[PDB]
Write a protein that binds this ligand. Structure first.
Ligand SMILES: C[C@@H]1C[C@H](N)C[C@H](c2ccncc2NC(=O)c2ccc(F)c(-c3c(F)cccc3F)n2)C1
Length: 274
């Protein structure tokens, strides 16, 4: 049984993704997050190695499970008559990047560099494991405040990574690329790089650059805060209108703005513990 193994704590939040609760594993008192999703609300379904019908999210989290701590670990999962329940690792203390940015405003470039580098390492891990997240954004990034380590969450809009065109999308529209808005078509890696440009702008400006479809299509970036020329260049490159003009993960990590990154513990020491 599920509610014999886990002591349910308060509701953390709910939305399109389902309902997420704080929890504790009864046996060892390990902090967990308990995600409930109704079967009717799941459009994308996957197949487990031994042919079991499960939400894509379970397939994807299983593919990215390893010792690497840049992706939230799926500890267990359960099927109920009209729902699925996922048990996820829960760092303590933790804060999502959206709340962190709301609280602190625009981030110092040294902090934004450390955070962006860790999300690039996490997204490269997903891609290397054949997983495309499709909803990279501040709300889907968790900060392990004690360790200065960032974790990617919510693979509910994800898909298996492929080299052919995607014509389906259920991620966040203001992080979606102009090829999706205009043609309902995009390729995995270049669409991920566009969302990364949106995220980097969000970190250094304290808000997203585009709100309307017309602004995404135009792709003209206005800087509302003081941002270095090198950081502005990387953002504008990730936000290139033509998908083939966007940098690869290697070109982002070799960019001059990305050099001399702080270690996660140094990041926590300078920017989080203080
Ligand atoms: C209340 C959340 C708001 C987010 N901005 C989004 C979170 C989310 C959305 C969709 N699917 C799954 C998720 N959550 C998770 O997998 C998950 C896993 C481990 C965690 F430590 C947390 C968590 C959090 F994210 C914020 C505060 C406290 C937490 F425990 N969440 C729910």
């Amino acid at each position: 049984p599920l509610e014999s193994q886990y002591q349910v704590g308060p509701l953390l939040g709910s939305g399109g993704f389902g309902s997420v609760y704080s929890g504790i594993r009864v046996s060892d008192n390990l902090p967990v997050a308990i995600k409930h999703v109704e079967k009717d609300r799941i459009s994308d379904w996957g197949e487990l190695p031994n042919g079991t019908r499960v939400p894509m999210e379970v397939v994807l989290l299983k593919k990215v499970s390893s010792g690497f701590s840049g992706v939230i670990r799926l500890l267990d999962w359960f099927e109920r008559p009209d729902s699925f329940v996922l048990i996820l690792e829960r760092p303590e203390p933790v804060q999502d990047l959206f709340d962190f940015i709301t609280e602190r405003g625009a981030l110092q470039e040294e902090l934004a560099r450390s955070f962006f580098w860790q999300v690039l390492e996490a997204v490269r891990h997903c891609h290397n494991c054949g997983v495309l997240h499709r909803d990279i954004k501040d709300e889907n990034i968790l900060i392990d405040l004690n360790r200065g380590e960032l974790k990617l969450i919510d693979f509910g809009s994800g898909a298996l990574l492929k080299d052919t065109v995607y014509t389906d999308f259920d991620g966040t529209r203001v992080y979606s690329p102009p090829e999706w808005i205009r043609y309902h078509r995009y390729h995995g890696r270049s669409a991920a790089v566009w969302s990364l440009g949106i995220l980097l702008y969000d970190m250094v400006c304290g808000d997203i650059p585009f709100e309307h479809d017309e602004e995404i299509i135009r792709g003209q970036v206005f800087f509302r805060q003081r941002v270095s020329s090198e950081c502005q260049h990387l953002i504008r490159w990730c936000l290139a209108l033509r998908p083939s003009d966007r940098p690869t993960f290697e070109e982002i990590q070799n960019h001059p703005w990305m050099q001399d990154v702080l270690l996660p513990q140094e990041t926590a020491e300078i920017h989080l513990h203080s």
